[PDB]
């Protein structure tokens, strides 16, 4: 009720009571008035944030090592044109099948929770997660960090969500920077740092 | 429950008086609806301005107006429809437009496609602004009723500010931009070499070279030495020989004078400061010699009712639109408009139909006011009561005039036709056997021709070239304007026009007067403004409401307007338009056959309808084939309308009953029970299709005929 809000002095919506991690009462359009919409949108945001962390680290880290002089990997924009041992459509089909099995299992978990928590072929192995979107278990949580006091879990999930929002923004920024200036993201940073006043438009 | 609910949903969508009985809410809804309409109009203007910048040959036409056909639409090549991209010239392919947008842009001084883009962006911004303003003024800051009823302040602002200042601003734009750019264009200067409009404002010697009076500055205006501004503020009259339109200096002077007059006229009605008249006082104090008491009581009627104001405004706007249509063909205001015949025919027909529709709307809303808002107890007015107390004498006399005019205008045509068929051409009403000359119109023409130099000392030429006595004007080998003769053929058609107008007036006025009650149904007011009938009693009471009177009057309005446009088209094609050889011989399009062929009904069927329709029916395979396709499609709609007009409701309900049984047999019966259309709806559907078919047929015929020749 008294948590910091996105717009101080304003009234937060009645469907955001602050229970969810990373909640700042930001929903001017009211896109999640209904509970089912709230749950679906929360799952979508979590998945987007995790994919963003995965992708953002894979774009700036290689370019940093390339410009510093350690590697020679090409620009991320043109990585889809390089040579490979097979046609890209075959790779697309294999990726589609594997990610299809994974995402189908995840989809089955959302609609009817607890229905996919057992190994199909080795019934001994199970997953110990209890909330949707956080599978837990030995496969995904080897270090045991996913269980504890509720305050610790809430804080960890909040920091994960904030990092995800930052990563999504950074990835979109890298895309638009390379579509506009026509050079690598690190080159843009170095050009800006060389002359912050003038090296923009 | 049933299907009539769906139809009723769209029928009462904009009837705010039925939803609520509070005047404040109706006024607020009306304000917001007006804002939405303004937004839509701005969006339409933005589209029109943008299309001419990207998909048009405006520049090539600007370099050669006479030999290039204007175009602003291009078709995608999907199903072989790209045959509509004709060779309009200028290295461009597309559909030739007839809305006269190129002439407006040329007369406004536009020379490149960069200005049109800016205008389109501005119009889009204005549309967004209007939409936001409508939302704000309905949901956030809605005015009170007392704000809407301050009609003394509304008139002051709408006269001084909207009309007074708009004319002044346009005169300023004309003086500063349109005159020099048009002077440069008329001098043969290539359009890309003309200086930009802001160079005239920034550099003053450039303007001084064209007009020396600009060197003196604004001092002669303040010193009352106004004769120095005569270089660009003239009173010449007549058409410009180079372009064929009115002189732009005359237009600038006219707009300046109009602005000053309107600004003076906007300071009449009283406001907080106590100077000026009050409308109520003017209405009350007025008592002439035959009125007696006067107009006491009209202020409350006109300030507490929206339908009376709507009726009055609709009638005035329709009359104004008809006047505008008449005044633009005879005194062409834009360059290269008179000699471009396709646009001239299209602009005259558009505004006539608009005016007719608006007049019929005025009649309908007067009937609505009489049915709903009339109140003799609280809003008594004397003149309306006296008009209602002798309505039998008004209608019976108007009924007689229609019969007399119809007989003495159509029996002449029938007599001519019979005498021609019997081999007796010396007994017809024509210029060779029995003459019925329109002497008054000829006297008017002579007086107007001789008015300059005697009664108009400041005029160098007549206002228009239609009055006999002027000289022919030729632009690019084509005929722009010349005196129009008047003979026996023009005597009959004018009386045809009078007869049709009188019949339409009779129908509408009878409906309005007998809206409240009649000798047949004394309690017709309680039944409503829009009801089908009152049963088969008293021999039959079909179509007794005022809505049915408007429904009948629409047919006669359509009948009346159609004869006007046919008269205009044939008279202009046969007597004015044409071409001139190098030696000065005029050859009209149809060679002057209107004088002898337009006196019998066979002449209109053979020489006009049969002879002039060969262009549309031979358009297959060419770029004009869309007109040929629309010609045949409109006949289908017109003939399809007759199913609803000739038939009744019970037959279709029984047919739908059998159909519903067949559907029930297979468990596909909808839960919303099908119902045939109501009695009133069946009438409304028929007339809509009738008018659509007729107007579309005439539109395709005219456009296919005039573009080819």
């Amino acid at each position: 009720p008294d948590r910091p809000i996105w717009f101080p002095g304003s009234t937060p919506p009645e469907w955001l009571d602050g229970s969810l991690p990373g909640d700042f009462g930001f929903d001017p359009l009211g896109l999640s008035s209904d509970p089912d919409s709230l749950k679906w949108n929360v799952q979508a945001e979590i998945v987007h944030c995790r994919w963003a962390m995965l992708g953002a680290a894979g774009i700036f880290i290689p370019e940093f090592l390339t410009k510093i002089g350690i590697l020679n990997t090409p620009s991320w924009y043109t990585a889809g044109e390089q040579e490979y041992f097979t046609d890209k459509t075959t790779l697309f089909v294999v990726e589609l099948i594997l990610i299809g099995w994974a995402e189908g299992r995840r989809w089955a978990d959302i609609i009817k929770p607890g229905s996919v928590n057992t190994d199909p072929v080795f019934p001994n192995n199970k997953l110990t997660g209890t909330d949707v979107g956080y599978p837990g278990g030995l496969w995904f949580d080897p270090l045991g960090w996913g269980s504890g006091s509720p305050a610790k879990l809430k804080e960890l999930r909040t920091k994960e969500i904030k990092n995800g929002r930052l990563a999504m923004l950074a990835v979109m920024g890298a895309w638009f920077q390379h579509i506009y200036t026509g050079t690598g993201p690190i080159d843009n940073l170095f050009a800006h740092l060389a002359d912050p006043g003038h090296a923009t438009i | 429950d049933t299907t009539t609910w769906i139809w009723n949903l769209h029928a009462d969508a904009h009837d705010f008086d039925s939803h609520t009985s509070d005047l404040e809410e109706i006024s607020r809804k009306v304000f917001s609806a007006h804002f939405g309409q303004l937004s839509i109009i701005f969006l339409w203007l933005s589209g029109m301005y943008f299309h001419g910048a990207r998909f048009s040959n405006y520049e090539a036409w600007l370099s050669d107006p006479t030999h290039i056909g204007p175009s602003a639409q291009v078709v995608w090549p999907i199903v072989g429809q790209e045959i509509l991209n004709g060779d309009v010239g200028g290295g461009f392919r597309g559909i030739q437009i007839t809305s006269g947008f190129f002439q407006i842009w040329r007369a406004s001084g536009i020379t490149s496609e960069l200005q049109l883009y800016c205008t389109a962006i501005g119009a889009l911004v204005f549309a967004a602004l209007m939409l936001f303003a409508g939302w704000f003024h309905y949901h956030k800051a809605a005015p009170k009723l007392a704000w809407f009823q301050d009609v003394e302040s509304m008139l002051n602002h709408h006269l001084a500010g909207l009309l007074g200042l708009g004319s002044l601003s346009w005169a300023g734009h004309q003086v500063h931009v349109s005159l020099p750019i048009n002077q440069f264009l008329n001098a043969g200067v290539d359009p890309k070499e003309i200086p930009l409009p802001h160079e005239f404002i920034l550099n003053r010697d450039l303007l001084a070279q064209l007009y020396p009076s600009f060197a003196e500055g604004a001092t002669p205006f303040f010193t009352l030495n106004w004769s120095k501004y005569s270089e660009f503020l003239t009173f010449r009259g007549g058409l410009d020989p180079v372009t064929g339109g009115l002189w732009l200096t005359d237009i600038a002077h006219h707009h300046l004078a109009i602005a000053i007059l309107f600004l003076i006229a906007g300071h009449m009605y009283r406001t907080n400061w106590g100077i000026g008249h009050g409308i109520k006082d003017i209405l009350e104090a007025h008592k002439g010699p035959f009125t007696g008491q006067g107009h006491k009581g009209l202020y409350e009627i006109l300030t507490t009712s929206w339908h009376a104001q709507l009726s009055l405004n609709l009638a005035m706007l329709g009359s104004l639109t008809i006047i505008v249509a008449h005044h633009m063909y005879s005194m062409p205001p834009y360059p290269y408009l008179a000699t471009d015949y396709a646009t001239q025919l299209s602009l005259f027909t558009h505004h006539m139909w608009i005016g007719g529709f608006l007049i019929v709307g005025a009649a309908a809303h007067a009937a609505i006011f009489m049915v709903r808002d009339y109140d003799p107890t609280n809003r008594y007015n004397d003149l309306l009561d006296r008009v209602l107390r002798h309505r039998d004498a008004i209608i019976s006399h108007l009924n007689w005039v229609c019969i007399f005019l119809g007989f003495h205008s159509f029996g002449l045509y029938i007599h001519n036709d019979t005498m021609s068929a019997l081999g007796r051409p010396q007994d017809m009403f024509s210029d060779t056997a029995i003459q019925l000359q329109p002497v008054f119109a000829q006297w008017i023409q002579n007086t107007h021709a001789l008015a300059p130099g005697v009664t108009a000392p400041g005029e160098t030429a007549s206002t228009s070239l239609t009055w006999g006595g002027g000289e022919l004007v030729a632009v690019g080998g084509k005929v722009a304007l010349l005196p129009i003769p008047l003979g026996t053929a023009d005597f009959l058609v004018h009386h045809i026009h009078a007869f049709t107008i009188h019949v339409t007036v009779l129908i509408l006025l009878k409906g309005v007067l007998f809206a409240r009650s009649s000798r047949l149904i004394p309690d017709k007011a309680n039944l409503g403004f829009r009801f089908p009938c009152d049963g088969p009693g008293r021999g039959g009471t079909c179509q007794v409401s005022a809505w049915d009177h408007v429904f009948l009057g629409l047919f006669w309005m359509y009948n009346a307007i159609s004869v006007v446009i046919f008269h205009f088209s044939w008279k202009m094609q046969s007597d004015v338009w044409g071409s001139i050889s190098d030696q000065g011989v005029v050859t009209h399009i149809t060679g002057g056959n209107f004088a002898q062929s337009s006196i019998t009904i066979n002449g209109w069927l053979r020489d006009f309808l049969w002879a002039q329709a060969s262009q549309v029916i031979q358009s297959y395979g060419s770029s004009l084939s869309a007109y040929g396709l629309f010609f045949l499609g409109a006949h289908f709609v017109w003939a399809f309308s007759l199913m609803f007009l000739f038939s009744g409701r019970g037959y279709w309900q029984e047919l739908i009953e059998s159909i519903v049984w067949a559907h029930n047999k297979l468990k596909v019966a909808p839960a919303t029970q099908p119902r045939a259309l109501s009695i009133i709806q069946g009438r409304a559907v028929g007339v809509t299709h009738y008018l659509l078919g007729g107007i579309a047929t005439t539109w395709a015929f005219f456009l296919a005929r005039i573009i080819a020749v």
């Binding site: 896109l31 008035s33 209904d34 | 999907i78 199903v79």
Partner: protein, 41 residues
Amino acid sequence: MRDLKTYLSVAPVLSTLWFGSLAGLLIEINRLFPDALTFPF
């Protein structure tokens, strides 16, 4: 919102979306297989 979905499912809007998708599809085949009178399969 829920009202946004409810207004989107009404008959006119749904019918317009369906017919627009249908027209786009039909134009797609007419562009891909133009001037067709017989089945060559």
